[PDB]
Nucleic acid binder design. Structure first.
Ligand SMILES: Nc1ncnc2c1ncn2[C@@H]1O[C@H](COP(=O)(O)OP(=O)(O)OP(O)(O)=S)[C@@H](O)[C@H]1O
Ligand SMILES: Nc1ncnc2c1ncn2[C@@H]1O[C@H](COP(=O)(O)OP(=O)(O)OP(O)(O)=S)[C@@H](O)[C@H]1O
Ligand SMILES: [Mg+2]
Ligand SMILES: [Mg+2]
Lengths: 442, 442
DNA sequence: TCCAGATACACAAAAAAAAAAA
C-alpha cells in the first residue's frame, strides 16, 4: 500500500521558502529535515535550511550554486527542476498550511510504522511473554505522540499566570468606568450585580404568562439603544412591530398605553409623543424583525448582514426561543430546543455581543405552596440552563396574593451567574406605561 | 428534455471562491450545497464550505488534500479537473450574479420534479380518491411557495414603523367611536375594560361544565351580527344547529327555552318569536357549521371561502378547541392542542378578524377551597395560555353555595390581557332565556 | 424526554378543636 504523503505539499513549501523569506520564522517551527519523503526533496530542503541559517540571502542562483558545490545539483533533477518548482508555486501566503499538512502526513506514516513494528512482535515472541508485549506498546505510542506538543495548551506554573494577573489588576487601577464594564441596563441595583450585560454571553429572561417579560426586555433594549452607538437588533416572533412601537412610545413619553391604542389623547400627551418622536428619529439606532418561524440559520444570516452593514451590534433580543423551528428535527422537541440554544450561544460568541433570549416556564410552579420560580421550571431545559450565562426570573407577588404589602413592585431573581453574585432585585412596576423603574422608596 | 442546469455558473462560483476567499460571506447567503446539479460539483462545494467555514485558507493544495483524505478525489476527476477549474476563471467581478442563476435553476428543477410527481401519483391512485390527491397537491404547492414566497422581509428600521404608527394613531384619533375601536360586546363594563374585541387577536372563553360558555359566546356572536355589516362565522363542533337556533330564538325573543323546545307556547310568545324571525330575516348575517372532527385546514378553507364570497368577516367562533384534531399528531395530545391553538392564532392574524376559542378547565380546581378559576386550570394548555391575547372566565357562585347572596348573578374574570388591564365584571344571568345581561345593582 | 390527567397510600400537620387557662 502507498504510504500517506503529499509531494505537492513539499513542492509548495519549497516554493514558498524560495519566493518569500519573511515567513521563515513560522515555517521553521513546524517542519524538520526528516519530515520530507522524497530523497531529492530532503536534500533540497536541507540545503535551503542550511543557506537560510547561514544568514546569506536565498535565491534560485545561490541555491543552484550551493547544490553544485556539493555536486548534488544533478542528483535533485538539475536547475530545470528547481526552476519548475519555483514557477509552479501557487502563492507564499499559505505556506503554514502546507507545513502542517507535511507534518500530519509524517506523523501518520510514523504511526503506521510503529503499528507494523508492534504487530510484527507476537508473530515471533523471541522469549518475551504477554506482559513484555503489553509493556512495549505504550512506550512506542508515547514516543510517537510526545514529538507533538500542545501550544500553548499545556499546564502552566503559578509564576506566569500570577504575573499576568498582576499586570491585569495594575492597569485596571485607573479608569474604573463607574463599575459597569458592558452594556448599562439602566437599573442601578441590577447593574451592581450583573455589572452590565457582558458581551459573548447568553442572557435568559423567563416568567409565567403576564408577568412583565417582554416589557423588561424591551426596556433593556431601549436603554441600550439610547446610550450605545451600535444598533440593537430585536426579533419579534410574537408581536408585530406596531405594538412594540406603541409600547415604546408609551414607556418613553409617560403616556398611558390604553389611550395610545384607542386614540384618546389630550394636548400634553401629543406634546410628549412629539418630543419622543423627535428623539427617536434623531437617534436611528433600532431594528425590529417581525417575521415568524425563523430558523437559527436565518437569524444568524440577518444578524451578520446588519453587523457588517453597520460595523457592529450592541444587543440582540429573541422573543422567544421556543418559537424557532429546526425542520431537520420536527419529530423531537427536546433536541430541537437543544439545537436552538446551542445556536444562540454560538451566535452570541461569534458576534461578541450579548443575546437576551426569552423563555417560558412549566405549569408545575403554581401547583406548590411557594410560587417562586426555580431553575427546573424552564420547559425542556437541559440545554437552556446548561449553556446559559445568566438567568433572570420575574416574580410579582400581587398576582398570586392580592393583599400582599408589595403592591406595585416586582422582583428580579438571578438564578445563575458564572462570574457574579446571585440574589433578588426589587423594581417598581407601572403596567399602564409598560415600564420598570428603580425603587426610590423603601 | 434535459433538466435545467448551468455548469458555467457553478464553475464561475467555484473559481471566484478559489481566487478570493474574502467574499464567502456574501456567497454563503445565496447558494447552498444541494442547489448544484452535478455530483462532483456538489462534493467540491461541500469541501469548499468545510474549508471556508473554519476560516482556514483555501487553495488548490488544501482542497485537493481535503478531498483525497476521504477517497473522493477520484470521483471529482482528480487534480487535473481542479486545476482546470482554477485556471478557467478570469476574475470574480460578478460572482454574486451566478449564485442567483444556480438558485433559480435549482428552484425550477424542484418545481418540475414536483409537477412530474403529482402527475405520476394521479396516474396511479393506489386506492386514493381525488380529494386526497387534490389535498396532497395543494399541500406540496403551499410547501414550495412558503420556502421562497418573498425576499423583501428582514430587519426594518425605526422610521417606517414610526410613520405607520403615527398614521394609525392619527386615523384613530380623528374618528372617535365612543371609546370602542373594535367589535362591541353588548356589555358596557366589558367594553370599557376591553375596548371591544380588537382585530387580529385570539380570545379564549373558559368555564367549568354547565357554566355558560356557549351561551356567552352566542350572545357575543348575536350582538356582533346585529351591529356589524360583515357576517359572523360559527363553528359548532358539539351541538347541532337546531339547538343553537332554538337557544338564539329564546335569547332574542325573551321566551322560555323549555317551552320552545317542548312546544307549549302562548300567543305573546308567538308574537315575540315572529318579531325575532322578521329581524333575523332582515339582517341575515349568520353562518353556522355543525360538522364534527374538523382539522384546522378545513376550518381555514371554509373561512377563506366565506370571506372571499362576502368580502370580509367580523367574527369567528370555535366551540370547542379540544374537539378539533390533527391526524398526524394523534400519539401526543399536548402537541395536538398546541398545533390547534397555533393554527387558530395564525388564522386570526391572517384574516384580521377576532377569533373566540372556547376551552374547558381541568378538575384540579375542585380540590381547592377557592373555586375561582385560574389561567393554569385550562386543559392541556401550555400554548392555550401562552398564545391567547384575552382570557375570560365565567364563575357562578350559586352552583357551589346554594344560598349565596349573589343568586341569579354571574361574574366574568379577565385572567389575562396582553395590552389591557385585568379585573372582574358582574352580570345578570337568566338561564331560562339562555342569555346574559347588564347589571344595575351594587 | 418532556407535558398533562387521574387513582391511591402515606407523610404529618395544619389548623382547628379544645381543653382549659385566665
Ligand atoms: N394599561 C395597562 N394597565 C395595567 N396593566 C397593564 C396595562 N397594559 C398592560 N398591562 C399589563 O402589563 C403586562 C404586560 O405583559 P407582557 O410582559 O408584555 O407579556 P409577557 O410577560 O411576555 O407574557 P406573554 O408574552 O403574554 S405569554 C400584563 O400583565 C398586562 O396585564
Ligand atoms: N330552562 C332552564 N332553566 C334553568 N337553567 C337552565 C335552563 N336552560 C339552561 N339552563 C342552564 O344553563 C346552562 C347552559 O350552559 P351551557 O352552554 O350548556 O354550558 P356549557 O359550557 O355549554 O357546557 P358544556 O358544553 O357541556 S362544557 C345549563 O347547563 C343549565 O345549567
Ligand atoms: Mg411576550
Ligand atoms: Mg358548549
Amino acid at each position: 500500500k502507498v504510504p500517506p504523503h503529499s509531494l505537492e505539499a513539499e513542492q509548495s513549501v519549497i516554493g514558498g521558502l524560495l519566493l518569500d523569506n519573511e515567513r521563515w520564522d513560522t515555517v521553521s517551527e513546524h517542519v524538520m529535515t526528516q519530515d520530507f519523503y522524497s530523497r531529492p526533496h530532503r536534500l533540497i530542503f536541507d540545503g535551503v535550511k542550511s543557506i537560510l541559517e547561514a544568514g546569506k540571502p536565498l535565491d534560485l542562483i545561490t541555491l543552484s550554486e550551493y547544490l553544485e558545490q556539493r555536486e548534488q545539483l544533478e542528483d535533485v533533477g538539475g536547475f530545470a527542476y528547481l526552476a519548475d518548482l519555483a514557477k509552479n508555486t501557487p502563492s507564499a501566503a499559505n505556506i503554514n498550511a502546507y507545513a502542517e499538512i507535511v507534518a500530519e502526513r509524517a506523523l501518520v506514516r510514523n504511526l503506521i510504522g510503529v503499528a507494523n513494528e508492534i504487530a510484527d512482535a507476537g508473530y515471533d515472541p523471541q522469549g518475551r511473554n504477554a506482559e513484555d508485549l503489553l509493556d512495549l506498546a505504550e512506550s512506542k505510542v508515547f514516543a510517537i505522540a510526545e514529538a507533538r506538543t500542545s501550544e500553548n495548551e499545556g499546564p502552566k506554573n503559578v509564576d506566569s499566570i500570577l504575573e499576568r494577573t498582576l499586570e491585569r489588576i495594575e492597569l485596571l487601577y485607573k479608569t474604573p468606568q463607574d463599575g459597569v464594564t458592558g452594556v448599562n441596563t439602566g437599573f442601578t441595583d441590577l447593574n451592581k450585580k450583573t455589572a452590565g450585560l457582558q458581551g459573548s454571553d447568553l442572557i435568559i429572561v423567563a416568567a409565567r404568562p403576564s408577568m412583565g417579560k417582554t416589557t423588561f426586555a424591551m426596556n433593556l433594549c431601549e436603554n441600550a439603544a439610547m446610550e450605545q452607538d451600535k444598533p440593537v437588533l430585536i426579533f419579534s416572533l410574537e408581536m408585530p412591530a406596531e405594538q412594540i412601537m406603541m409600547r415604546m412610545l408609551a414607556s418613553l413619553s409617560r403616556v398611558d398605553q390604553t389611550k395610545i391604542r384607542t386614540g384618546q389623547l389630550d394636548d400634553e400627551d401629543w406634546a410628549r409623543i412629539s418630543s419622543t418622536m423627535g428623539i427617536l428619529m434623531e437617534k436611528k439606532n433600532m431594528y425590529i424583525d417581525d417575521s415568524s418561524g425563523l430558523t437559527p440559520t436565518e437569524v444568524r444570516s440577518r444578524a451578520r448582514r446588519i453587523a457588517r452593514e453597520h460595523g457592529g451590534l450592541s444587543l440582540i433580543m429573541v422573543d422567544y426561543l421556543q418559537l424557532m423551528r429546526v425542520p431537520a428535527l420536527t419529530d423531537n422537541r427536546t433536541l430541537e430546543i437543544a439545537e436552538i440554544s446551542r445556536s444562540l450561544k454560538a451566535l452570541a460568541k461569534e458576534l461578541n455581543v450579548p443575546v437576551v433570549a426569552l423563555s417560558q416556564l412549566n405549569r408545575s410552579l403554581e401547583q406548590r405552596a411557594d410560587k417562586r420560580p426555580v431553575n427546573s421550571d424552564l420547559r425542556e431545559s437541559g440545554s437552556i440552563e446548561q449553556d446559559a450565562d445568566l438567568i433572570m426570573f420575574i416574580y410579582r407577588d400581587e398576582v398570586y396574593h392580592p393583599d400582599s404589602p408589595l403592591k406595585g413592585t416586582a422582583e428580579i431573581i438571578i438564578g445563575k451567574q458564572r462570574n457574579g453574585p446571585i440574589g433578588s432585585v426589587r423594581l417598581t412596576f407601572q403596567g399602564h406605561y409598560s415600564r420598570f423603574d428603580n425603587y426610590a422608596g423603601p
